[PDB]
């Protein structure tokens, strides 16, 4: 790590802190992140693993840093997160083609992901990173106060063993937030996430979500609240994207949208690639 100079912290994490960095040797502006623990074998794998999983719309892992019984990720560096950037277009909204068009890259980042069998589990504007060309990568994933605002309905009720689904519900949540320029479930506990859930999109039963009573954390004394419209949730939006929408937030992780079907969906028949206009 006597390598790197440290610039500046960008961010705390799960895994761990994150500087900007800038390589000794290459002259490299680099992101570099000191995992928060010596290192299991098992870990060394799972990252060896991540160093390979390379696509556009995934933020490169440079090098993996295992000395001195330490481990540091070195990763490609990006100039802004989505958070400083929808935070920064809060009065005007950002421009319905640049939401599409990063919807549109990062499902496509979440479909070779989940085509390697690889998932996010995170997903939240802070780890969204954007560069002046309008492109948006995938950021902090692979190596499996907390935000629950993007957590899929069977996280919070127990699953253990759940699928590449919860990226897409993650996204979704995101997507809703893009659009209304609000937080769609800003819950501030797991029981308050969920019931915010339940409050828009009604309380989950056999009809909607075979199992869903048998779950983990299910509760037959949960209330019962009646759906509401996704007119109601997401105005102004369009009917193709608010059709979109509803299949990235189906209970029923089953029928919840694949990453590649919503690639297909009517919504991106217009997609383009705006620049936007970023205040660095
Ligand atoms: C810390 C938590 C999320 C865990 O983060 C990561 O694991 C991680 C991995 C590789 C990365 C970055 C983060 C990163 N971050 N860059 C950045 C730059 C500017 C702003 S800001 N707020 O707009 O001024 C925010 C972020 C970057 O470039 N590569």
Same mark, same amino acid.
């Given at each position: 790590m006597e390598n790197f100079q440290k610039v500046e912290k960008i961010g705390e994490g799960? *895994?761990?802190?994150? *500087?900007?960095?800038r390589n000794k040797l290459t002259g490299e502006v680099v992101a570099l992140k000191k995992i928060r623990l010596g290192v299991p074998s098992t870990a060394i794998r799972e990252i060896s693993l991540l160093k390979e999983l390379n696509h556009p719309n995934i933020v490169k892992l440079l090098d993996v840093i295992h000395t001195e019984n330490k481990l540091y990720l070195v990763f490609e560096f990006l100039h802004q997160d989505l958070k400083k950037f929808m935070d920064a277009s809060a009065l005007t909204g950002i421009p319905l083609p640049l939401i599409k068009s990063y919807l549109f890259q990062l499902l496509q980042?979440? %479909?070779?992901?989940?085509?390697?069998?690889?998932?996010?589990?995170?997903?939240?504007?802070q780890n969204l990173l954007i560069n002046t060309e309008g492109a948006i990568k995938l950021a902090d994933f692979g190596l499996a106060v907390v935000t629950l605002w993007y957590r899929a309905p069977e996280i919070l009720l127990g699953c253990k063993y759940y699928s590449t689904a919860v990226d897409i519900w993650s996204l979704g949540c995101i997507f809703a937030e893009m659009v209304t320029r609000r937080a769609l479930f800003p819950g501030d506990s797991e029981i308050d996430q969920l019931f915010r859930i339940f409050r828009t999109l009604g309380?989950?039963?056999e009809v909607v979500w075979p199992g869903?009573?048998?779950?983990?954390? *299910?509760?037959?004394?949960?209330?019962?609240? %009646?759906?509401?419209?996704?007119?109601?949730?997401?105005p102004p939006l369009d009917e193709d994207g608010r059709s979109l929408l509803s299949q990235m937030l189906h209970y029923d992780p089953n029928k919840r949208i694949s990453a590649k079907a919503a690639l297909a969906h009517p919504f991106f028949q217009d997609v383009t690639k705006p620049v936007p206009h970023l205040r660095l």
């Open positions: 799960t *895994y761990g802190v994150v *500087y900007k960095a980042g979440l %479909a070779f992901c989940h085509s390697h069998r690889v998932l996010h589990r995170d997903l939240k504007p309380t989950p039963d869903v009573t048998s779950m983990p954390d *299910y509760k037959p004394s949960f209330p019962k609240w %009646a759906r509401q419209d996704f007119s109601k949730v997401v």
